[PDB]
Ligand binder design. Structure first.
Ligand SMILES: *[C@@H]1O[C@H](CO)[C@@H](O[C@@H]2O[C@H](CO)[C@@H](O)[C@H](O)[C@H]2NC(C)=O)[C@H](O)[C@H]1NC(C)=O
Lengths: 220, 214, 182
C-alpha cells in the first residue's frame, strides 16, 4: 500500500525560492516516473512537471519553465521541486504523483502515467508581513459572531466559550482582500432568550503572530 | 499540445446515474485519457485510464458503478446508482509530448437531500470598528441546499461593485450549506447613505436584507 | 544471433495464466521492432526502463512470460497489485524491471459459442511469491484436509474464463507478454 507525503510548503515573498519534497514509501521508487501538480485556491488542477525514472528526462509546464526545477534522489526515495523567483500566481496546493512509463503510438515515444496522488502541501506567495487580526463583535433564535479582520498569513482558529460552546457554531472560510490581508467570520445561532443570562466569548487564535484574542459579544 | 473540454457542471439525483463527458481537441482525436476524482476538502484520486477502443484499466479500489466508454473524439465517465460520496470534481487528463494536460473539471452535485432556501442575516459595522476608522458590512448566508448563490450589494438603491468579497459555499455540521459576503466602506460612506442592501439570489428566488445607520 | 522476440508475440498458442510459460532469451542481438511496427498493444507499461530507448539496454538475459487473461484482469500485471490473478497466478516483484505488453485477441481466443479453454486459479492457501508458478490441481479445502468436490468445504481451485466474441470489452481475451530484464 503506497503513500506519497509532501513537505516544504508555506509563505515566502515574491521573487524568493522554496524547495518542496515528496517522500515515497511502499514501491520501488527508482523505477516509476514522478510528477508535480498544483491547485491554486479555488482553481482547477494544473500539471507542473514530470521526471523519468532515472532523472535523465524532465518536462515542464510552460508557466514554470526557467524558474522551477524537478529532481529526485533515488537513494532516498524523495522527489523535489525547486521553485525560484516565486510569483503570487504560484500560490496553490502542490501534490506529487507517480506512474508507470509507457510507449504511446500516437506520440511515438514515452508517456508518463499519473496513477497515485499525494496528500499535498500549501505554498503561499505574498508581499504581506506577518500580522495579527482585529476581532470585532457581530452583536445580535438569534445569530451572533466574530469578525476576524485583516490578518496574515493563515490560519486562524475560533472556538467559542473556550470550546464549551459548539452547537450552532460555524466558522466561515477566509477571504483574501485586494489589500493582501485575510478575513473570516465565525457565527453561532443561539436561543433568543439566553442573551440576558449567558455570556458569549469567541476565542481567536493566530499562531503566526503569537496573537490570542478573547472577545466578548454582547447585545446592542 | 492537446486540449480537453469538460462541461463545467452537472447534477443528478441520488440513486440516479450520470455520464460525464470529456472531448479531445480535433487534432488528437484518438488520444487516451485518464479520469481523476476530487471530493470536497480532499486530494485527487485516480479512477481509470481510458483508451480509444473503449478499454479501461481501473486503479485498485474503484467501485463498479464507474465505467469508461469511448466514441469519436469524446470520452465518457459513467457513474451508476449515485451515492452521497460521489459528489466531487472529475478531471479528465491526457498526455502530449512529455507533458500532461488536464481539463477544467466537472463539479458533479448529487441532489441527495430536500431543497433549501437560504437564511440571510446582515450585520452593520460594529461601533468598535467605527472607532477604528473602518466599516465593514457582514452578510451571512446559511441553511441552504444546494450551495449555489449570487450576491449583489446596493448603496441606497444603486448597486455597489467596489469593496465586495464573498466566500464560496461550504456545508455545515447539519449537512446544509453556508456562505458569507463582505462589503468594505469608509466611515463617511457608511454615514452618508440611507440604506444598504444585501441581495441573495438562490435558484431564481431572492432574499433581501437591508440595514441603515442610526 | 537474432533474438526470438518475434516468435513469442507470434505464437499461435498461448497458455493459461496459471500455467504461464517463460522463454529464456540470451546471447543474441535484440530487434524490438515488433513492439513499434504493430500498433495494437493496448497495454505497454515499463518499470525501471524506457519503452522507447529499449535496445540501449545491455542485458545478460531477458525473460519472456506469456499467458491469457480477460481485459479487466490486465491491470493486475503490475508490481504491487492484488486480486485473484496477481495473488494466485502471476506475481510481479516490487522492483520488477521490464515492460508489460497486452493486446486484445478476441478474433482468435473468443468464439460465438464460448471458449472455456483458458483457466485461472481462484483458490489457494498462500499468496504466490514473485515469479512463482503453481500447476497443481488438488481440491481446495479451508482446513488443508483431503476432500472430494462437491463436499464439506471443497472446491476445485481452477475456474474457466468464458470468452465470447460478443461481450463487454473487459470480458474479452487479452494476450499478455511480460519482458523481464537482467
Ligand atoms: C514470426 O514468426 C515467423 C514464422 O511464423 C518467423 O518467420 C521465420 O523466422 C525464421 C527464423 O527467424 C526464418 O528462418 C524464416 O525464414 C521466417 N519466415 C517464415 C515464413 O517462417 C518470424 O521470424 C517471426 N517474427 C519476426 C519479426 O521475424
Amino acid at each position: 500500500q503506497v503513500q506519497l507525503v509532501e513537505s516544504g510548503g508555506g509563505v515566502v515573498q515574491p521573487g524568493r525560492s522554496l524547495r518542496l519534497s515528496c517522500a515515497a514509501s511502499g514501491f520501488t521508487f527508482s523505477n516509476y516516473a514522478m510528477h508535480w501538480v498544483r491547485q491554486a485556491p479555488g482553481k482547477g488542477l494544473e500539471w507542473v512537471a514530470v521526471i523519468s525514472y532515472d532523472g535523465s528526462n524532465k518536462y515542464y509546464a510552460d508557466s514554470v519553465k526557467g524558474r522551477f526545477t524537478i529532481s529526485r534522489d533515488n537513494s532516498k526515495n524523495t522527489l523535489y521541486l525547486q521553485m525560484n523567483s516565486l510569483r503570487a500566481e504560484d500560490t496553490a496546493i502542490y501534490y506529487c504523483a507517480s506512474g508507470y512509463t509507457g510507449y504511446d503510438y500516437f506520440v511515438r515515444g514515452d508517456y508518463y502515467g499519473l496513477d497515485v496522488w499525494g496528500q499535498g502541501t500549501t505554498v503561499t506567495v505574498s508581499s504581506a508581513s506577518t500580522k495579527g487580526p482585529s476581532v470585532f463583535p457581530l452583536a445580535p433564535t438569534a445569530a451572533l459572531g466574530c469578525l476576524v479582520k485583516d490578518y496574515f498569513p493563515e490560519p486562524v482558529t475560533v472556538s467559542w466559550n473556550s470550546g464549551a460552546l459548539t452547537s450552532g457554531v460555524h466558522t466561515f472560510p477566509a477571504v483574501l482582500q485586494s489589500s493582501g490581508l485575510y478575513s473570516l467570520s465565525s457565527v453561532v445561532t443561539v436561543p433568543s432568550s439566553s442573551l440576558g443570562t449567558q455570556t458569549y466569548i469567541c476565542n481567536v487564535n493566530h499562531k503566526p503572530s503569537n496573537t490570542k484574542v478573547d472577545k466578548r459579544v454582547e447585545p446592542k | 499540445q492537446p486540449v480537453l473540454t469538460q462541461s463545467p457542471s452537472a447534477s443528478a439525483s441520488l440513486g440516479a446515474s450520470v455520464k460525464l463527458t470529456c472531448t479531445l481537441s480535433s487534432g488528437h482525436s484518438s488520444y487516451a485519457i485518464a479520469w481523476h476524482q476530487q471530493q470536497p476538502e480532499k486530494g485527487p484520486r485516480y479512477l481509470m485510464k481510458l483508451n480509444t477502443d473503449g478499454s479501461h484499466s481501473k486503479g485498485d479500489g474503484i467501485p463498479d458503478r464507474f465505467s469508461g466508454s469511448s466514441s469519436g473524439a469524446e470520452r465518457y465517465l459513467t457513474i451508476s446508482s449515485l451515492q452521497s460520496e460521489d459528489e466531487a470534481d472529475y478531471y479528465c487528463q491526457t498526455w502530449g509530448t512529455g507533458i500532461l494536460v488536464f481539463g477544467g473539471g466537472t463539479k458533479l452535485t448529487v441532489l441527495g437531500q430536500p431543497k433549501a432556501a437560504p437564511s440571510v442575516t446582515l450585520f452593520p459595522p460594529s461601533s468598535e470598528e467605527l472607532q477604528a476608522n473602518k466599516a465593514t458590512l457582514v452578510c451571512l448566508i446559511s441553511d441552504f441546499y444546494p450551495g449555489a448563490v449570487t450576491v449583489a450589494w446596493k448603496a441606497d438603491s444603486s448597486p455597489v461593485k467596489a469593496g465586495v468579497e464573498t466566500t464560496t459555499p461550504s456545508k455545515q455540521s447539519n449537512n446544509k450549506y453556508a456562505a458569507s459576503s463582505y462589503l468594505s466602506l469608509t466611515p463617511e460612506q457608511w454615514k452618508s447613505h440611507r440604506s444598504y442592501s444585501c441581495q441573495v439570489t438562490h435558484e431564481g428566488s431572492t432574499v433581501e436584507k437591508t440595514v441603515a445607520p442610526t | 544471433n537474432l533474438c526470438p522476440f518475434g516468435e513469442v508475440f507470434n505464437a499461435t498458442k498461448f497458455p493459461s495464466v496459471y500455467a504461464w510459460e517463460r522463454k529464456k532469451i540470451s546471447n543474441c542481438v535484440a530487434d524490438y521492432s515488433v513492439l513499434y511496427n504493430s500498433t495494437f498493444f493496448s497495454t505497454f507499461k515499463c518499470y525501471g526502463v524506457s519503452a522507447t530507448k529499449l535496445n540501449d539496454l545491455c542485458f545478460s538475459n531477458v525473460y519472456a512470460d506469456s499467458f491469457v487473461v480477460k481485459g479487466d484482469d490486465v491491470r493486475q500485471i503490475a508490481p504491487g497489485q492484488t486480486g485473484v490473478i496477481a495473488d494466485y497466478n502471476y506475481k510481479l516483484p516490487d522492483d520488477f524491471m521490464g515492460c508489460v505488453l497486452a493486446w486484445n485477441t478476441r478474433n482468435i481466443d473468443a468464439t460465438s459459442t464460448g471458449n472455456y479453454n483458458y483457466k485461472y486459479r481462484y483458490l489457494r492457501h498462500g499468496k504466490l511469491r514473485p515469479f512463482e508458478r503453481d500447476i497443481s490441481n488438488v481440491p481446495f479445502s479451508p482446513d488443508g484436509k483431503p476432500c472430494t468436490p462437491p463436499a464439506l468445504n471443497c472446491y476445485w481451485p481452477l475456474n474457466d474464463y468464458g470468452f465470447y466474441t460478443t461481450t463487454g470489452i473487459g470480458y474479452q481475451p487479452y494476450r499478455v507478454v511480460v519482458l523481464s530484464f537482467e
